[PDB]
């Protein structure tokens, strides 16, 4: 029951500020780049498909990674090890039964040992100070969906798609809180499917007017438009599945009417 929905929403809005990554961090990494991060994330999407992991598990892993890379320098050869330990941790946090560690070693094709992954897990825990219950775009979406009239499952699939697209590109997406990105994804998916718009229920609840969403929306629309050309294609291929009503086949709108 919706007894706690206001309370949880408010608390998630508090926590997302506290669980925010450093926006300008990739420029202080001497060895890694937005483009490598993009490859790592796209690979994590496939790992999650491979092991049938929940979508929340991927968003959590990417939040752990960005918070980690916010304070720890990492050589390109160790980036995938940070990614693997994050996905393991997120699976333990969020999955019913997470894959075994051996499975995580198997998925890098044995490029690290089980010990290395395990020690990296401990390091990730220490750096994150065991704070793993991070609000994600996927969580703000789920809450937002309660406000559909009526619920439309293409709208739901499509907003998830878009919210996942944003995990891939540090620039620009690390500028926005999950609640804002979720706001843009939801509007853009609604608009795409039906022509409808960020509903007034949510304007009041979130305090986000459609105008305030504008910068994030502009970016997300451009991402949506260019997705079929993007270097990384994992999320598109995922959201062609009938599970997802093939929403990632749908034609994006060429203008937003803003």
């Amino acid at each position: 029951v919706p007894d706690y929905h206001e309370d949880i929403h408010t608390y998630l809005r508090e926590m997302e500020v506290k669980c925010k990554p450093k926006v300008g961090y990739m420029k202080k990494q001497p060895d890694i780049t937005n483009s490598m991060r993009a490859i790592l994330v796209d690979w994590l999407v496939e790992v999650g498909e491979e092991y049938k992991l929940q979508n929340e598990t991927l968003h959590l892993a990417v939040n752990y990674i960005d918070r980690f890379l916010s304070s720890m320098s990492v050589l390109r050869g160790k980036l995938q090890l940070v990614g693997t330990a994050a996905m393991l941790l997120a699976s333990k946090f969020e999955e019913i039964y997470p894959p075994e560690v051996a499975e995580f070693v198997y998925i890098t094709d044995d490029t690290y040992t089980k010990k290395q992954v395990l020690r990296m897990e401990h390091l990730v825990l220490k750096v994150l100070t065991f704070d793993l219950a991070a609000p994600t775009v996927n969580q703000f979406l789920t809450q937002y969906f309660l406000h559909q009239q009526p619920a439309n499952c293409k709208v739901e699939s499509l907003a998830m798609f878009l919210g996942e697209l944003s995990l891939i590109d540090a620039d620009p997406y690390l500028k926005y809180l999950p609640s804002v990105i979720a706001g843009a994804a939801f509007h853009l998916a609604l608009y795409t499917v039906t022509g409808q718009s960020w509903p007034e229920s949510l304007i009041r609840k979130t305090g986000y007017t459609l105008e305030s969403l504008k910068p994030c929306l502009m970016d997300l629309h451009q991402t949506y438009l260019k997705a079929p050309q993007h270097a990384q294609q994992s999320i598109r291929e995922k959201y062609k599945n009938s599970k997802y009503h093939g929403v990632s086949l749908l034609n994006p709108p060429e203008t937003l009417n803003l």
């Binding site: 490598m36 790592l40 050869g77 980036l79 995938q80 094709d109 490029t111």
Partner: peptide
Amino acid sequence: RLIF
């Protein structure tokens, strides 16, 4: 293996 991701090669970067």
